[PDB]
């Protein structure tokens, strides 16, 4: 149908629907309201005056044209091609359920800790701190965890914050640190110096979090997505082979 | 000159050499290692490929093809119509200069402080601390600040940090606070306290910067790029302007 006409010729709604469809993003120019589909209209003609007006400046002889042109007509081919190839490829449910199954030791959220420590250079101040604590428990045992930390802790980087480290898994710090911390009871601290590179540590768990299993329903559609693009890769570069193969091709 | 044959049918230099002059960036192919220049050979040849295979399916029949090639050929049309545009827009020095003077008091570098502070909620809090870092100064003053911070200081915000604030501009707090701080010499603390909504601070100041005035020759290429984009949107609509009127349009 026509929605304007310019210099005599009608212009359908149409076209002015397929040069923003790209756009509109699937929602159908006929639903916009009056006053935008009357916009889109204006900015189509004025794309339409510019088109007159290059081909009146014989813009399509120029080279920046016919050259990029030239580009746009053989990329658009192949992309249309490996399109068509896109469309023939789909990932039966067995496939993805079974590459879950093979990988299902994977698919899990490892297990955390959240602490707190003190940082001294030597055996005996650990211990004596961690008898200052001896015998408190819960919130008590933390503010004066805190404290002492605050107090006398040697760590740059967490005696300023009560000796705060936050949430943390096993790939994050070394072995005897986390050895100690992941043995603990919630709420306790160790009631022996932990000793490392760094010195001597008396270290207090606040929580933990246990190994966790990711659920098949939570991954499948990321795993179909990844065995898709891959059998997609597969099929390309087959087909890349089949046509490559089948040329007689010769390097000068 | 001819770099291979495929089929019989000559490849030349210039064809791949044009076909990865976007990728190139302004290198160009003759001066890869032979390695390179094979690879890109190669990838040619397969592009060639898959473009004589899709004719074969009759690809260029495909509305997918048909319809994204009628886009991309007027899409091209109105980007070197505007190109052309683009290449009449020219800002003389006398304009980037101009622009620069005429703003000149907006292309500086605000005054900023680094300063710690304690906060309490009784003037006569504030002026113990006072009293108790009296006749100290330098880096003596600086380590008992942030001691009393840490032991007095009820800003949860930096109260662990001995005070510390950071560099900040006169925008960034409230003015009461601001003004003091701007007001100290380096290295000194407010010998009264300062009265705001959160209560009665004591400020240290560590440094300070003075306003600084950014030259013409910082900022003169960003300038004339941003009167250059100006001067073509300017350009551009006039044109769009020109070519609407011209035009005898009707709206149904």
Redesign the interface.
């Known amino acids: 149908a026509?929605?304007?006409?310019?210099?005599?010729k009608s212009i359908s709604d149409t076209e002015v629907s397929?040069?923003f469809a790209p756009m509109l993003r699937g929602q159908d120019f006929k639903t916009l309201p009056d006053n935008q589909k009357?916009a889109l209209?204006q900015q189509y003609?004025?794309?339409d005056?510019?088109?007159q007006?290059?081909?009146k400046?014989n813009?399509?002889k120029?080279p920046?044209?016919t050259?990029?042109?030239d580009?746009?007509?053989?990329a658009?081919?192949?992309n249309?091609?490996?399109?068509?190839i896109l469309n023939t490829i789909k990932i039966d449910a067995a496939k993805v359920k079974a590459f879950y199954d093979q990988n299902k030791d994977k698919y899990v959220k490892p297990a955390r800790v959240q602490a707190k420590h003190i940082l001294v250079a030597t055996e005996k101040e650990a211990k004596d701190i961690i008898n200052e604590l001896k015998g408190l428990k819960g919130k008590e045992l933390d503010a004066k965890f805190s404290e002492l930390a605050?107090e006398k802790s040697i760590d740059p980087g967490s005696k300023?914050?009560?000796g705060e480290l936050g949430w943390f898994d096993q790939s994050t710090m070394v072995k005897p640190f986390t050895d100690a911390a992941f043995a603990l009871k919630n709420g306790t601290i160790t009631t022996t110096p932990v000793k490392t590179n760094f010195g001597y540590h008396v270290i207090l768990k606040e929580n933990s979090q246990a190994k966790g299993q990711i659920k098949f329903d939570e991954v499948k559609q990321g795993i179909e997505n990844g065995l898709k693009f891959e059998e997609f890769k597969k099929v390309i570069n087959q087909?890349?082979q089949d046509?490559?193969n089948?040329?007689?091709?010769?390097?000068?």
């Open positions: 026509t929605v304007a006409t310019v210099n005599g397929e040069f009357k209209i003609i004025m794309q005056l510019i088109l007006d290059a081909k400046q813009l399509e120029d920046l044209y050259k990029e042109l580009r746009a007509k053989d658009i081919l192949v249309v091609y490996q399109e068509k605050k300023n914050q009560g087909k890349g046509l490559l089948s040329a007689k091709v010769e390097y000068k």
